[PDB]
Amino acid sequence: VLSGGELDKWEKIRLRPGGKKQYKLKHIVWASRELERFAVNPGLLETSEGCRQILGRLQPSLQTGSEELRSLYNTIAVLYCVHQRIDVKDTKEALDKIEEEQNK
Amino acid sequence: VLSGGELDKWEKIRLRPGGKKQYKLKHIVWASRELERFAVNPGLLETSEGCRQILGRLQPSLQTGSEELRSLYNTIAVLYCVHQRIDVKDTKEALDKIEEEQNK
Amino acid sequence: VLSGGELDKWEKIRLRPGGKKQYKLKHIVWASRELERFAVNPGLLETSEGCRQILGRLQPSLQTGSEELRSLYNTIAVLYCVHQRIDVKDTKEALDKIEEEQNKS
């Protein structure tokens, strides 16, 4: 899913703003299993364009989405930023960037 | 999900028109678990507007929906009517009243 | 889902073009359970019209869909062709023939 350089960036990103815990490999495994449970191709996680397609497929479900769906969306937003080489310190900054790109 | 006065109303409502069996607390517990399973926020059951948003989210699936999906929709339609202080005797009257409001 | 005559045709249909493995009853059982998991009425597998409604419900998810979702769609496409008495040798021919029928509009 991620190259060696992308994995180094991934594991520096904090789960919550100002928190200590950071993303791990297991979050990518979890996201991949989650997409399977939602009948979405986990192979889309491998590219920026694939993550964009996943976010677009999930976005109409966000307003009413459970905590599980929101966490999945947030995780793939971070992955999109890592693929795009966008520097983000935490999950919220990636969501900010997703909103900014969509509005552009 | 329901206040004390609302729960008293809930348990007078008949599952079927003219039937003996009536709604119970377990139907609310079940509906909350069902929404989590469909990745919908169960906290939306707590308000009229939240129930309205659930019904709109589920409605495109009704035509081809399984028995489980239709029962879930019907239960939340009754819950919407209870939150709105709309007096209904049974599930069918709740569905009738919601369709007429939608036509307005 | 299928009559006895339909089951005989079903089990002659190849999963892949020119392949050896063929459709089995377990594919119908599996398709029926999959639909329940997707909150779709499995009784719709019993008729041509019901199968058309399922395919229409699933088709927008195909582009981003998992392997499981695509296999389910393809299985139901084959089942639609069997209900319609459309002769198919394999899954790919069933998808092709369904596409041609839609283009007649």
Residue numbers in the entry:
A (entry chain D), B (entry chain A): 7 to 110
C (entry chain E): 7 to 111
Paper text:
When mapped on the putative hexamer of trimer model of MA, these residues were found to point toward the hexamer centers. It was also shown that substitution of residue Gln63 with Arg suppressed Env incorporation defects of the L13E, E17K, L31E, V35E, or E99V MA mutations and of a gp41CT mutation that has the same phenotype. To explain the role of MA trimerization in Env incorporation, it was suggested that the Q63R mutation in MA may stabilize the trimer structure such that MA lattices that form large hexamer holes are favored over those that feature small hexamer holes. However, it is not clear how this substitution can stabilize the trimer form. To be able to assess the structural changes in the MA trimer, we determined the high-resolution structure of myr(–)MA Q63R protein by X-ray crystallography. Interestingly, the two crystal forms of myr(–)MA Q63R yielded structures that are essentially identical with slightly different parameters. Each asymmetric unit of the crystal structure contains two trimers. The structure of the myr(–)MA Q63R trimer in both crystal forms is virtually identical to that of the WT myr(–)MA protein with slight orientation differences of monomers in the trimeric assembly. The structures in the two crystal forms revealed only minor conformational changes in the loops connecting helices I and II and helices V and VI. Intriguingly, the guanidinium group of Arg63 is 2.5 Å (averaged across 12 examples in the asymmetric unit of the two crystal forms) from the hydroxyl group of Ser67 of an adjacent MA molecule, which forms new hydrogen bonding in the trimer interface. Our findings complemented the biological data by showing that the H-bond formed between the side chains of Arg63 and Ser67 is key for the stability of the MA trimer and hence to its function in rescuing Env incorporation.
